[PDB]
Amino acid sequence: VKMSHPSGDVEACMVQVTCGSMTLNGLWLDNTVWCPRHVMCPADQLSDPNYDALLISMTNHSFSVQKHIGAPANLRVVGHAMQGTLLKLTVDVANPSTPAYTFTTVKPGAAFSVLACYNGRPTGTFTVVMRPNYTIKGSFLCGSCGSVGYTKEGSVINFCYMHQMELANGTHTGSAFDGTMYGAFMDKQVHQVQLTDKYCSVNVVAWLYAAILNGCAWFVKPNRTSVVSFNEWALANQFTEFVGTQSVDMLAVKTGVAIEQLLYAIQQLYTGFQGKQILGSTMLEDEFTPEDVNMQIM
Amino acid sequence: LVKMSHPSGDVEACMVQVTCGSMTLNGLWLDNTVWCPRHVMCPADQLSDPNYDALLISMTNHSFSVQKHIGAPANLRVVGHAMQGTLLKLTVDVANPSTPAYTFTTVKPGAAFSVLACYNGRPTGTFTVVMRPNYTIKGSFLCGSCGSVGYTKEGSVINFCYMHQMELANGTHTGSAFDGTMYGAFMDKQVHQVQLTDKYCSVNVVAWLYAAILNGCAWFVKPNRTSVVSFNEWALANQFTEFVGTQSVDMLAVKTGVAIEQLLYAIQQLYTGFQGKQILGSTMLEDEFTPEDVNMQIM
Ligand SMILES: *[C@@](O)(CO)[C@H](C[C@@H]1CCNC1=O)NC(=O)[C@H](CC(C)C)NC(=O)c1cc2c(OC)cccc2[nH]1
Ligand SMILES: *[C@@](O)(CO)[C@H](C[C@@H]1CCNC1=O)NC(=O)[C@H](CC(C)C)NC(=O)c1cc2c(OC)cccc2[nH]1
């Protein structure tokens, strides 16, 4: 099951940011509003913007911030700065419902929750994994820029994504909160090509373990491939590096099946499924992490 | 096409923990009323054959402890208690100051809704399920999840449709509507129960094929057509639900130009075999996406 964190924490932080005739979502934490910087850019310049000239041309009053959740309010902007592909706006009132938070960058294969927003109003939530080519496969429509992606550890939200674009293949990307765009895509209105996607090997392993736990173990055999041998094969068949984790070990102890058997099985199941099914799938499944398998199948 | 849930913040502000004896589970706080599954009155020795009428009469308002954890912690004093089908309807003296606009409508097979999974009154995760024709759902419910709540949102109104009660040996799940009746008439006792046979949700297979077409996957479309009446008599023989068209479906017909009866014909052929070919990454029919899903996500 694709399970998301409860989103109420993050809903209380979503705002609408308007600049000239551009409008998108922003994140209100304490005295700061984060939002994508292209809100500054008029339409006649989206294809080829000069963000530094645009930033100089803005004043605090160029920016309009509104809260539509709970007690609606207008937030007075009293400072503006740019950080990579984000604007960092300072407002005069602190968000009284600010969670404990950090900013982290997610590595490919890691899962996180997304709150999709339109005009500062939360509309849906879903879970994604960062692909090896630094894209995600969510559902983002018009007005979804500034929607936020995050994980939770205890009561602390770790913010990891702010939405910026949709590639022509329907896939999506955005920034970490240091301003850097995932996959180095540029925040301008141009057709851009992503690198070839790969399978997240550790996720495929975790999924096969989940199959065995539910009683589906047909692919299991005594044939082993070593970690180092599998990884050499992976470079030629568009798989990531396998890296072991204690999470994967838990799933090998409980299952009594070695990673090396599953690594061999991956090579053979990639060749083809020979007609059968694994957990309702006829293709490899790489969007469930070892942590998901550990928490869901007990 | 992706599994998508409503934002859960509205519902999180309504969850409470309900304790009775050595028993504890989740509750839903709306106005002055807390709903929860009635088996919280039963001790675990007796769950196999609970005497719910006798349990209710032996309970006093002090037999129930309702605790709110999300936000500012408080104990909610019980000043009334009643039973309605498989649910308890407790009256507390403090009205929930964050009660959303809501309705209580039972969902039909093939409809999708969002679940807030909770443990001892604390929300832990959210996901979407669809009600199967055998009145089960397939989410992720662990120990302590009874009282977790299922819902849909239209505009500002929350429609509460599901209160979690049980896990079948199949790994599948069921619970109550908020009128107190159990989906599929499963009984709320610690006994083995076998669900009825599943079916494919016909109207959702149609929606998914429309989604295939919109995304450039249309090899399965032929000129050939099966009427709704002819398809439905076939559905009875082949474990499909009766196809009932809606405006939501017709919208997809118009955007694509592929009529409903073309997809009904295609389904009959696809159910016999995809012949190695794929539709949206699948070698099998998919019925977990509704027409509304396809409209919102692809248009
Ligand atoms: C945000 O709403 C914008 O603030 C918007 C979200 C997408 C609109 C449709 N679905 C979405 O997810 N983002 C964009 O419009 C961005 C803006 C950039 C970062 C300045 N641009 C694109 O997503 C974009 C541009 C182009 C393109 O050009 C030419 C050609 C093809 C695809 C494409 N996507
Ligand atoms: C609630 O958390 C309980 O308050 C719990 C939820 C399930 C636990 C695992 N996943 C869930 O959805 N509910 C139960 O444990 C209920 C309680 C009964 C009605 C008193 N029981 C079952 O779901 C149950 C009992 C049995 C069983 O017996 C023997 C045999 C097989 C399956 C089964 N399920």
mmCIF file of C-alpha atoms in Angstrom, chain B residues 98-263:
data_model
loop_
_atom_site.group_PDB
_atom_site.id
_atom_site.type_symbol
_atom_site.label_atom_id
_atom_site.label_comp_id
_atom_site.label_asym_id
_atom_site.label_seq_id
_atom_site.Cartn_x
_atom_site.Cartn_y
_atom_site.Cartn_z
ATOM 1 C CA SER B 98 -13.317 22.140 14.786
ATOM 2 C CA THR B 99 -16.286 20.061 13.574
ATOM 3 C CA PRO B 100 -16.282 20.111 9.744
ATOM 4 C CA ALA B 101 -19.341 20.309 7.595
ATOM 5 C CA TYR B 102 -20.197 16.650 7.187
ATOM 6 C CA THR B 103 -22.661 14.029 5.979
ATOM 7 C CA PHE B 104 -23.092 10.307 6.792
ATOM 8 C CA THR B 105 -23.634 8.458 3.475
ATOM 9 C CA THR B 106 -22.965 4.766 2.799
ATOM 10 C CA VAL B 107 -20.642 4.090 -0.171
ATOM 11 C CA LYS B 108 -21.352 1.589 -2.911
ATOM 12 C CA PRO B 109 -18.987 -1.004 -4.401
ATOM 13 C CA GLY B 110 -16.506 0.623 -6.778
ATOM 14 C CA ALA B 111 -16.416 3.954 -4.963
ATOM 15 C CA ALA B 112 -13.106 5.243 -3.638
ATOM 16 C CA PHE B 113 -12.450 6.984 -0.338
ATOM 17 C CA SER B 114 -9.621 8.139 1.867
ATOM 18 C CA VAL B 115 -8.675 6.491 5.166
ATOM 19 C CA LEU B 116 -7.033 8.169 8.134
ATOM 20 C CA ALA B 117 -5.392 5.280 9.997
ATOM 21 C CA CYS B 118 -5.055 5.993 13.732
ATOM 22 C CA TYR B 119 -3.714 4.357 16.884
ATOM 23 C CA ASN B 120 -5.045 5.255 20.370
ATOM 24 C CA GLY B 121 -6.424 8.528 19.016
ATOM 25 C CA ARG B 122 -3.325 9.619 17.072
ATOM 26 C CA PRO B 123 -3.334 9.733 13.240
ATOM 27 C CA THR B 124 -0.453 7.780 11.790
ATOM 28 C CA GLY B 125 -1.065 7.502 8.031
ATOM 29 C CA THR B 126 -3.423 8.062 5.142
ATOM 30 C CA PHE B 127 -4.245 6.104 1.956
ATOM 31 C CA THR B 128 -7.052 5.487 -0.538
ATOM 32 C CA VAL B 129 -9.156 2.340 -0.919
ATOM 33 C CA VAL B 130 -12.079 1.309 -3.064
ATOM 34 C CA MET B 131 -15.025 -0.647 -1.745
ATOM 35 C CA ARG B 132 -15.000 -4.038 -3.456
ATOM 36 C CA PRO B 133 -18.168 -5.794 -4.661
ATOM 37 C CA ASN B 134 -17.681 -8.214 -1.726
ATOM 38 C CA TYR B 135 -17.817 -5.234 0.728
ATOM 39 C CA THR B 136 -14.162 -5.466 1.719
ATOM 40 C CA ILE B 137 -11.295 -3.014 1.301
ATOM 41 C CA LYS B 138 -7.569 -3.547 0.960
ATOM 42 C CA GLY B 139 -5.687 -0.913 2.901
ATOM 43 C CA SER B 140 -3.082 -1.106 5.659
ATOM 44 C CA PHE B 141 -4.649 -1.606 9.124
ATOM 45 C CA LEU B 142 -2.520 -2.821 12.025
ATOM 46 C CA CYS B 143 -3.124 -3.533 15.709
ATOM 47 C CA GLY B 144 -5.090 -0.710 17.329
ATOM 48 C CA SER B 145 -6.609 0.680 14.109
ATOM 49 C CA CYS B 146 -10.311 0.032 14.912
ATOM 50 C CA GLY B 147 -12.177 3.324 14.870
ATOM 51 C CA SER B 148 -10.060 4.660 12.009
ATOM 52 C CA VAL B 149 -12.237 6.574 9.633
ATOM 53 C CA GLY B 150 -12.943 6.581 5.910
ATOM 54 C CA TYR B 151 -14.245 9.580 4.020
ATOM 55 C CA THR B 152 -14.705 11.593 0.837
ATOM 56 C CA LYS B 153 -14.767 15.393 0.434
ATOM 57 C CA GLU B 154 -16.976 17.432 -1.879
ATOM 58 C CA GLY B 155 -16.222 21.130 -1.637
ATOM 59 C CA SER B 156 -16.186 21.905 2.080
ATOM 60 C CA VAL B 157 -18.393 18.945 3.095
ATOM 61 C CA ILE B 158 -16.796 15.764 4.469
ATOM 62 C CA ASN B 159 -18.776 12.604 3.798
ATOM 63 C CA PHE B 160 -17.910 10.049 6.494
ATOM 64 C CA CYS B 161 -18.490 6.548 5.090
ATOM 65 C CA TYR B 162 -16.328 4.034 6.973
ATOM 66 C CA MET B 163 -15.360 3.192 10.585
ATOM 67 C CA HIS B 164 -12.809 0.319 10.735
ATOM 68 C CA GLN B 165 -13.711 -2.786 12.727
ATOM 69 C CA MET B 166 -11.923 -5.860 11.379
ATOM 70 C CA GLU B 167 -9.382 -7.868 9.359
ATOM 71 C CA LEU B 168 -10.470 -11.046 7.541
ATOM 72 C CA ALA B 169 -8.040 -14.017 7.255
ATOM 73 C CA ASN B 170 -7.685 -12.883 3.610
ATOM 74 C CA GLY B 171 -5.746 -9.801 4.735
ATOM 75 C CA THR B 172 -8.741 -7.727 3.543
ATOM 76 C CA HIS B 173 -10.692 -5.333 5.815
ATOM 77 C CA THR B 174 -14.208 -4.180 6.653
ATOM 78 C CA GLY B 175 -16.099 -1.926 9.023
ATOM 79 C CA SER B 176 -19.295 0.033 9.590
ATOM 80 C CA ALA B 177 -21.137 2.825 7.920
ATOM 81 C CA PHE B 178 -22.027 5.619 10.325
ATOM 82 C CA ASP B 179 -25.628 4.455 10.389
ATOM 83 C CA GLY B 180 -24.169 1.496 12.319
ATOM 84 C CA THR B 181 -24.638 -1.214 9.694
ATOM 85 C CA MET B 182 -21.591 -3.289 8.774
ATOM 86 C CA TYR B 183 -20.464 -3.325 5.161
ATOM 87 C CA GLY B 184 -21.370 -6.728 3.756
ATOM 88 C CA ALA B 185 -23.143 -7.636 6.955
ATOM 89 C CA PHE B 186 -20.044 -9.092 8.517
ATOM 90 C CA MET B 187 -20.485 -9.626 12.208
ATOM 91 C CA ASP B 188 -18.496 -7.790 14.839
ATOM 92 C CA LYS B 189 -17.332 -10.791 16.846
ATOM 93 C CA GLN B 190 -13.983 -12.610 17.158
ATOM 94 C CA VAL B 191 -15.064 -15.370 14.747
ATOM 95 C CA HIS B 192 -13.875 -16.690 11.398
ATOM 96 C CA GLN B 193 -15.844 -15.226 8.488
ATOM 97 C CA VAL B 194 -15.446 -15.827 4.746
ATOM 98 C CA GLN B 195 -16.187 -12.959 2.385
ATOM 99 C CA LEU B 196 -18.233 -13.458 -0.785
ATOM 100 C CA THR B 197 -16.650 -13.764 -4.213
ATOM 101 C CA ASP B 198 -15.078 -10.619 -5.606
ATOM 102 C CA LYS B 199 -15.937 -9.070 -8.963
ATOM 103 C CA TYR B 200 -14.321 -6.568 -11.272
ATOM 104 C CA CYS B 201 -15.858 -3.091 -10.948
ATOM 105 C CA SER B 202 -16.971 -2.664 -14.554
ATOM 106 C CA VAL B 203 -17.401 1.112 -14.509
ATOM 107 C CA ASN B 204 -13.834 1.536 -13.193
ATOM 108 C CA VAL B 205 -12.266 -0.713 -15.842
ATOM 109 C CA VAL B 206 -13.952 1.545 -18.424
ATOM 110 C CA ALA B 207 -12.456 4.609 -16.681
ATOM 111 C CA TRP B 208 -8.971 3.115 -16.704
ATOM 112 C CA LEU B 209 -9.241 2.261 -20.405
ATOM 113 C CA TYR B 210 -10.271 5.856 -21.120
ATOM 114 C CA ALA B 211 -7.173 6.874 -19.186
ATOM 115 C CA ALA B 212 -5.126 4.535 -21.375
ATOM 116 C CA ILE B 213 -6.535 6.212 -24.484
ATOM 117 C CA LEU B 214 -5.853 9.758 -23.243
ATOM 118 C CA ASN B 215 -2.232 8.774 -22.625
ATOM 119 C CA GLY B 216 -1.716 7.346 -26.131
ATOM 120 C CA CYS B 217 -2.404 3.645 -25.441
ATOM 121 C CA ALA B 218 -5.302 2.584 -27.638
ATOM 122 C CA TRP B 219 -4.335 -0.670 -29.405
ATOM 123 C CA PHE B 220 -7.329 -2.372 -27.780
ATOM 124 C CA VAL B 221 -9.906 -0.030 -29.321
ATOM 125 C CA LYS B 222 -11.838 -1.614 -32.207
ATOM 126 C CA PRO B 223 -14.897 -0.309 -34.080
ATOM 127 C CA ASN B 224 -16.848 -3.200 -32.564
ATOM 128 C CA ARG B 225 -19.405 -2.464 -29.870
ATOM 129 C CA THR B 226 -21.278 -4.322 -27.141
ATOM 130 C CA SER B 227 -24.480 -2.746 -25.843
ATOM 131 C CA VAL B 228 -24.862 -1.958 -22.134
ATOM 132 C CA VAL B 229 -27.645 -4.555 -21.856
ATOM 133 C CA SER B 230 -25.623 -7.224 -23.652
ATOM 134 C CA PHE B 231 -22.503 -6.446 -21.619
ATOM 135 C CA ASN B 232 -24.470 -6.617 -18.374
ATOM 136 C CA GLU B 233 -25.851 -10.090 -19.089
ATOM 137 C CA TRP B 234 -22.261 -11.130 -19.903
ATOM 138 C CA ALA B 235 -21.050 -9.516 -16.646
ATOM 139 C CA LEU B 236 -23.322 -11.822 -14.645
ATOM 140 C CA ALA B 237 -21.519 -14.839 -16.127
ATOM 141 C CA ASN B 238 -17.950 -13.582 -15.812
ATOM 142 C CA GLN B 239 -17.584 -11.910 -12.373
ATOM 143 C CA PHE B 240 -18.105 -8.312 -13.464
ATOM 144 C CA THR B 241 -20.438 -5.822 -11.834
ATOM 145 C CA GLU B 242 -23.280 -4.328 -13.783
ATOM 146 C CA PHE B 243 -22.090 -1.335 -15.775
ATOM 147 C CA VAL B 244 -23.990 1.818 -14.786
ATOM 148 C CA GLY B 245 -23.032 4.897 -16.759
ATOM 149 C CA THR B 246 -22.613 8.317 -15.174
ATOM 150 C CA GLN B 247 -22.004 11.850 -16.423
ATOM 151 C CA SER B 248 -18.397 11.406 -15.356
ATOM 152 C CA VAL B 249 -18.040 8.539 -17.855
ATOM 153 C CA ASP B 250 -19.724 10.423 -20.730
ATOM 154 C CA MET B 251 -17.197 13.212 -20.250
ATOM 155 C CA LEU B 252 -14.406 10.765 -21.036
ATOM 156 C CA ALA B 253 -16.273 9.451 -24.094
ATOM 157 C CA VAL B 254 -16.466 12.990 -25.480
ATOM 158 C CA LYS B 255 -12.849 13.947 -24.823
ATOM 159 C CA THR B 256 -11.662 10.701 -26.464
ATOM 160 C CA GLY B 257 -14.322 10.118 -29.110
ATOM 161 C CA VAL B 258 -14.334 6.430 -28.113
ATOM 162 C CA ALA B 259 -17.840 5.406 -27.134
ATOM 163 C CA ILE B 260 -18.649 3.462 -23.969
ATOM 164 C CA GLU B 261 -19.854 0.461 -25.964
ATOM 165 C CA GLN B 262 -16.462 0.239 -27.688
ATOM 166 C CA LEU B 263 -14.811 -0.126 -24.274
#
